[PDB]
Amino acid sequence: GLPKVEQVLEVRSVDSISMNLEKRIEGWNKCITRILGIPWGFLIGAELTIAQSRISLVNKIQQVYRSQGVQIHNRHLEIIVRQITSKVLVSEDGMS
Amino acid sequence: FQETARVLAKAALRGRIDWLKGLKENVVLGGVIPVGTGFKG
Amino acid sequence: MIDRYKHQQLRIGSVSPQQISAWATKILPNGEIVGEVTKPYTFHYKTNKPEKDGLFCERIFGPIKSGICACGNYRVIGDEKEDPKFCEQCGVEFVDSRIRRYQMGYIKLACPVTHVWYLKRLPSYIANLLDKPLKELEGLVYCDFSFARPITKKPTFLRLRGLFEYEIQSWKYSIPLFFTTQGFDTFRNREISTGAGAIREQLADLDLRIIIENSLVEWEELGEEGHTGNEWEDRKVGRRKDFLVRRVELAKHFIRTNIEPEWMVLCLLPVLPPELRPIMSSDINELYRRVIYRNNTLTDLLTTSRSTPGELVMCQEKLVQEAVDTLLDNGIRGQPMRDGHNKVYKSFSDVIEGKEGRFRETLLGKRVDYSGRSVIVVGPSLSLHRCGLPREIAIELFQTFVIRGLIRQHLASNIGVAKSKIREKEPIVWEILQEVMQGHPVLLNRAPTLHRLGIQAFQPVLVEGRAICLHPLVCKGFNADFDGDQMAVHVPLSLEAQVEARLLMFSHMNLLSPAIGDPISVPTQDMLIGLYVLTSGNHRGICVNRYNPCNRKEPFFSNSYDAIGAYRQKRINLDSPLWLRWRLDQRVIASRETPIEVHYESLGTFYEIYGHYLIVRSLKKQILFIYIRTTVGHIALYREIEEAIQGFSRAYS
Amino acid sequence: NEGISTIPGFNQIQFEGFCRFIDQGLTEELYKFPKIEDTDQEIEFQLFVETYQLVEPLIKERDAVYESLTYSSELYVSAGLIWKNSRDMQEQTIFIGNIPLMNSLGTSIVNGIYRIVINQILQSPGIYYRSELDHNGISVYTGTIISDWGGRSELEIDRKARIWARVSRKQKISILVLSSAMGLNLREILENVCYPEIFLSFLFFQQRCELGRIGRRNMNRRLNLDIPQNNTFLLPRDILAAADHLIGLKFGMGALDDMNHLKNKRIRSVADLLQDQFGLALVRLENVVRGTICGAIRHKLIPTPQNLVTSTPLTTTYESFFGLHPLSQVLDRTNPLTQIVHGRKLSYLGPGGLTGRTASFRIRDIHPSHYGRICPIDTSEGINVGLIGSLAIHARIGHWGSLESPFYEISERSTGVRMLYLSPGRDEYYMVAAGNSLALNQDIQEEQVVPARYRQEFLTIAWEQVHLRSIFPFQYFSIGASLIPFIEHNDANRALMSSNMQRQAVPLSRSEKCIVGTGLERQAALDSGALAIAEREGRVVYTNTDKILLAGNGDILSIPLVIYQRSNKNTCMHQKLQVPRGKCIKKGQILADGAATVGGELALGKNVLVAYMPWEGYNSEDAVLISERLVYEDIYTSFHIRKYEIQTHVTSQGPEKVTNEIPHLEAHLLRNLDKNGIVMLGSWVETGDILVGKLTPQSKETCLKLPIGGRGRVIDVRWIQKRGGSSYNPETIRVYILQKREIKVGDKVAGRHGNKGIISKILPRQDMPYLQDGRSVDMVFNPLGVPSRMNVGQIFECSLGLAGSLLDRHYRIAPFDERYEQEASRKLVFSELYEASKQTANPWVFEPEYPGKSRIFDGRTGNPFEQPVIIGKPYILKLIHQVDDKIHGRSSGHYALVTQQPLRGRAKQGGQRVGEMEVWALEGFGVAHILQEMLTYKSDHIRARQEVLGTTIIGGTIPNPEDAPESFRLLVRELRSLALELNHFLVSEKNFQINRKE
Amino acid sequence: GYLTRRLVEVVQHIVVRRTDCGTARGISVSPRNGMMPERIFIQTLIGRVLADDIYMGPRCIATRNQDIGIGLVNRFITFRAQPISIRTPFTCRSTSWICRLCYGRSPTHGDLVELGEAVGIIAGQSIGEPGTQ
RNA sequence: GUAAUCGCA
DNA sequence: ACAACTGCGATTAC
DNA sequence: TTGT
Ligand SMILES: [Mg+2]
Ligand SMILES: [Zn+2]
């Protein structure tokens, strides 16, 4: 319930949020380097991960809220989610 | 909000400049918050 | 649509000793400089007077009373006659004593000290800039050691070139005697230094460009084949790389921030304004007295003789630095340094950080004037905009307004007579109080303000009691039950605040919860029961009749008013069935069911009997009459809603 | 010998604890004192422990409470000092210090304050054998040994044998090395231990070994050992055995230990705390003796024993303990029930115990071991939920520090009956059945089945196999829960609320007993201590309001009564005579009736007619509509007494002077003052008057004024000269005002079944609904609370009360009356109502169509209501929380010295706080100007605030403040004291200029 | 209480300061993607602003920059509309602030969010308050 | 002015 | 090393 | 304590 809500929002681990999500994310991180080259691999991987994570992060929170009968609109959950998934981390290889 | 001394020392050593575009920023300063009637249009 | 551009930029940074000196330094008319704190004394013995050149000194900070001075002659600031700004005999200026609140001080330190935040935090900015390890710096600061070369921009005859000198056993007595003793003193700074000079010389004599260049070179070198190694070696390479990146970032920021790393080691320590640490006595001031005592003892030992033993002055330097650490931030090193009662001392970091710290307790949350709390009761005959307010609270909240009213009307000559009349509970005071708040909005609020509906606005109505009445339909919003709950009251003074309260924060403008946009104010417990009893229905089948009507409702009313009057006259019961004629509307919600029976006569008029209504028609397919079969409850609810709408529409005109 | 055939005394726990303390703890502590010998000649002083004699207090309790003095006893012990030069030992008796004494009620008097010592529940020393499953692999098993000081000698086992102690911070430690250091030669170790193959295959000190007697016993129990009780030390055999069990746990031969079991916990009583305080005082005394001997050697004088010892350590130690210890709290005397329920509390939180945050969830739940020993429905609501609990009625504290409960033994024997206080661990290995035996199925009665308890489980077994039986009705509850009639028909959740609300009742001016009760009010009033019980048989020759004279066996004893005193919670205490002149009274009977007690039974409320129906919204949520009869007949009138005192503190410059003639004050005040600067007795005062007038030279006017809400008669004033402080002390002037409070809108009322409400309207009797009798109901309650909070026993109570009032009967019913049959409460209630209806021919009381419900009329219109309503006379209490106390209002009066925000507290005339959760709502609504005004000029902006009054009086518009509030300026000053700058630096968009705001 | 506090902080800054940001992208909401719950689909569509026109043959049911309502959702589920492009705080062109069209209908009254409203705080409270249940 | 302790909803 | 509900009110102890 |  509420502990599960806290858990998803503070994304301690991606395995906690979902195993399929972590599997797909690591699969994209591994495979997307091969195809689409350097400039159009990172961008498309970031977009795909953003879409999948947002969809997942919402569906989970909305299911947790609806299991108890609490009806909330997805817009409020979206504003918060965007902030979670709005930043990117530069890898250690690139320094300029 | 959680680690006051750490972020204060970091901003002091860096020399950060904050533009008060947030609510709590004007709350601490004691001014008109740029929300609702405080938003000039 | 050019927007209104407001530009405000708060700025934070490390301050030079010159600025912390200029925060306190002032030039008296005689020509002396004030601001230095040099004596641990706060107040005189059994005189309760500020001691001179002390923590509460009048000369360096300001006078303790408005217009009075320590010399004993009162003066008036801003008078037409020429008056000296400060007494010649006594340094204290003639000014309002608000300065003690905003005036700072500074203690000159003979031996420099190091800031706890930069040094003893797990990310050490000093250890980051100076590639020397953190343990080496912590030793050189706290445990008597020596650094061989602290200056890299001056000539150095000695070729020690060592990082940490664990002992002074190296030959130095033959070296000092050989050179002139004054000469040895002159170059020892470029030579091995100890305690707090090596750190300052390293931070001062440093080239950030060379630092970023060397760090970039070392970063380019590392990472070639470190990942191929074991997890331990890869981890070490990664940590080193992260340290190098942090060093590059720190140096790049230091290049273009008009801030110098020299300011991390504090030459002079500022002193808080006296009023902010008022003595009852505070720990702040206890730590201040301790550091003042240790610093003056160190200065005495230094000025006594150069032949003094190095061990004593070094131990006193360590004591001064530990006192500075306990004053600035205690608990980072892990030593509590308890008081005489085995209680830990509070520090400035403990003052700012915490729930009970400066920020959360003061800036983001505060109490206001014009406020009152009381228990809440139901007022079931109030409107959504009106709330019951007790008079003993209103007289205190609107006291200034009723004073103005008593002054305006020929009832009170001055503020004192008006206040006395208000205290005497005269009858005209209550009339003026009523006339005052007829158009003033009251802001009620609750302690568990979870949602945005915790604070609303109502129109206060004067009541004779001590319990704040509240409308029943508005309870859900406040999560309020009358089992002992209490609420607060707030009065908007400014006209803009009054307009905001009257327009935005009223109940009639907030009827939908901001979660899913659903009605938040609805009949809940007793009104729902009444409505359910009204619209429940009647016994239809075996309950109403004992035998089948096959072997064998009655009242017919043309208007709803007639049926309601008959119910008031007890002619018909609440659930008693009846027939009501309708004027060709067909708005009754019912099931899609065909007529149970249809009677068709020769002349052409056919009667269509439905489940809940009868519709008589003629040969011309014309609906002659419609009769609805219902009870007084449904028609009463329909009539009350329709009459509410119609009365609203009529009252609008 | 006692408590096995009747309900024991509620205060017997503190009584026996203080008795055991005085009996043995003082001598045990005096035995361990060392021989003071600190010199080269080794001049040695000694205290003859055998000559230990306490002395009676010099003053009485009624003088200690009046003069604010401690009630203690004098400890005199003969001492012998052998001087170096004299070569002889002179023997004299010395006054070590004062030891506080406990009253018969369990309370102690220290500095004129009544204080109680709450018990603490602490884990017993022993070996615990917990287990923990690893993330990958087999589960790790660990054994912890707990010492009295709190040592933790852990032992762990990995996937291998790996018998590693966790004492060291490092990875591990060798158990064989520890055994060899203990003294084992590595041969007898393997010879003695079982499964030696596992041990051989694998290839500070005083506090850890400071096991208590309890520790020794427990160690012996878990690990079968034959070590004598006396040898309370961690022997290596114990360690060896521990290791053996640990290895055995790996192969399945073991059982882990439950650390929530009572048998694994000890209870610390007042004796345990007083013994440690006396030990600390003895240590301080030995230090002082060494110091004074060192000083006498410096002064070249051989002094008498009296010169060495000073009475300071004992007195200051006991005073500091009673003042600052977390387990020494002031007695709650709101009502007689609070005095008894306060001393039964057992607390987990305390010195050496789990803090609120530290406590795990497991700690706060009922363990089957708590049955009959601890209350499962009495806790403290808040962050400390499940950590503060009460003690069962029939419980006792055992020899080994364990709570014990009385269990009947149905097993056949010579006596065939026994009442044994089995300890927590012993009752587990017994078949305890709480059911009755009234069942026959054509077979022998012993073949019947009954639910029972075994091995902390529930099961159904034959009557042949049940060893024990729990007969006592009040065995599993406490005083608070047991005072709830028909508790079976109420939810367990509401029971805690009712127990908490019974504590809040206010003693009324008049007292009336309850028609329906549980029968525990008698012993509650007996043990409360607010009752006059004779201590001698005789006849009452003289009866007076102030004193009662009892003449017996040729001796006359005088008992002083209490006339309108004041409690700690501003509640009046008064006593009235019950026995008339000329009747005989035994040793134990009631002579007089105290407050909230009539006829010898606890009476915290009144019996009023009640109807359960909605009335025009006045009952919405919980709210009560009451009639004016309760007002003009003084049904719920109460007296409250509040004290105000200001000391005449003598400053170094000048002492305070108390004068009546003080200038700069209006002539409307000072009328009440006498020639001396004090108010006169019998003077009515109000808010803003002067009670004590002082010149205060150091002149000024530090007087005493009345705050908002204080309007009462001045009953008595006390001039208290303070002495015994080693110097002249300031005099204390204490005034007392009595405020008669009637029932008003906003007051809280409650019922014993968890029903609580706030009065909302006082309608006249003519508007109130009336029965078919013609009488208007006193209160109307909301009928929708019953399905919500699940309180069904209230209905029963109401009905039985109506029946009793009509038939003039009082019903004392023990809980769980359904053990006799089914619907026993319903049968009883309906039977009594019928009888009432027949005897007084009021047919309405029992309606055959709807039993318990009648049809009432409306007072306004006179028309009957459609559906029948419940009519009864429950017991309603008036709670302490009252509207007058909660009313508050501030305009602009006072500010804090440093923050400059308005002050906090109702007495200090402070405003309300706008927290972060309210700033968020204000920002969500969009009211920026309201937030700005509240954050600047209603709170902290000195200039703006000064200008606000002028602008409001003149009528001009209030300008928007532009300067920073004092809170921000403070921050800047603080941060710049921390060498951090902060500047506003606003930039103009017009001309691109930076302007600093200071 | 703790959960309600943290959330507010993260999203405190957001406030509606623009009528439109100019984004041409929108999320596609389709029933068959998530097992097709009708009530959930209706709750998702209601309150959002369309980012692309919906065509059923030559006729256009709803154009761009239009606020979906219960009637529009019923028409869509009746005509069996294909994945619909709507505006959302995700497709906004800024992270410090959003616009009226990206947010959509206001929960308070039932129209576009007016400039100056702080929706960040509102969302935090609307998520925290039902957390008790 | 700070603590300790209890209560409140 | 860091944080773990919101406030209010009462008392005694410094 | 509990987890970070
Ligand atoms: Mg409530
Ligand atoms: Zn029963």
Swiss-Prot record, chain A:
It is found in: Plastid, Chloroplast. Belongs to the RNA polymerase beta' chain family. RpoC2 subfamily. In plastids the minimal PEP RNA polymerase catalytic core is composed of four subunits: alpha, beta, beta', and beta''. When a (nuclear-encoded) sigma factor is associated with the core the holoenzyme is formed, which can initiate transcription. DNA-dependent RNA polymerase catalyzes the transcription of DNA into RNA using the four ribonucleoside triphosphates as substrates. This is DNA-directed RNA polymerase subunit beta''. It comes from Nicotiana tabacum. The chain holds residues 1149 to 1244 of 1392 of the full protein.
UniProtKB/Swiss-Prot annotation, chain D:
It holds the Pfam family RNA_pol_Rpb2_3. This is DNA-directed RNA polymerase subunit beta. DNA-dependent RNA polymerase catalyzes the transcription of DNA into RNA using the four ribonucleoside triphosphates as substrates. One of its GO terms (molecular function) is DNA-directed RNA polymerase activity. Belongs to the RNA polymerase beta chain family. In plastids the minimal PEP RNA polymerase catalytic core is composed of four subunits: alpha, beta, beta', and beta''. When a (nuclear-encoded) sigma factor is associated with the core the holoenzyme is formed, which can initiate transcription. InterPro entries: DNA-dir_RNA_pol_bsu_ext_1_sf, DNA-dir_RNA_pol_su2, DNA-dir_RNAP_su2_dom, DNA-dir_RNAP_su2_hyb_sf, RNA_pol_bsu_bac, RNA_pol_bsu_CS, RNA_pol_Rpb2_2, RNA_pol_Rpb2_2_sf. Keywords: Chloroplast, DNA-directed RNA polymerase, Nucleotidyltransferase, Plastid, Transcription, Transferase. One of its GO terms (cellular component) is DNA-directed RNA polymerase complex. It comes from Nicotiana tabacum (Common tobacco).
